[PDB]
Amino acid sequence: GVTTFVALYDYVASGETDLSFKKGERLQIVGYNHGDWWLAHSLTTGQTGYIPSNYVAPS
């Protein structure tokens, strides 16, 4: 599989974290138009966090 990606655009973190939730809780998805997200690790900065899928390309 592809292990490394390149950022195609700048992205500034909003500070949002993941959300704890209980089975049976009702949730609304926000910002669907921006697409899905993945957890990633920066080789360049060493930090880890969520990134938008459509901001990266295989490298």
Next chain:
Amino acid sequence: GVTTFVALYDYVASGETDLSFKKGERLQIVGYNHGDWWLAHSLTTGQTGYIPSNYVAPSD
């Protein structure tokens, strides 16, 4: 479109945030086997944050 979802399993937050990055930075995707994530808002608790896609189903 579907505006509300129901959680099928419990999920406990890890505390990870989103990541700032510059165009041209190289990144490695972690935990691909867990699938993709969405931003969501809890109707029951009022909080917002990332959730795993395969933990929710469309709901009324």
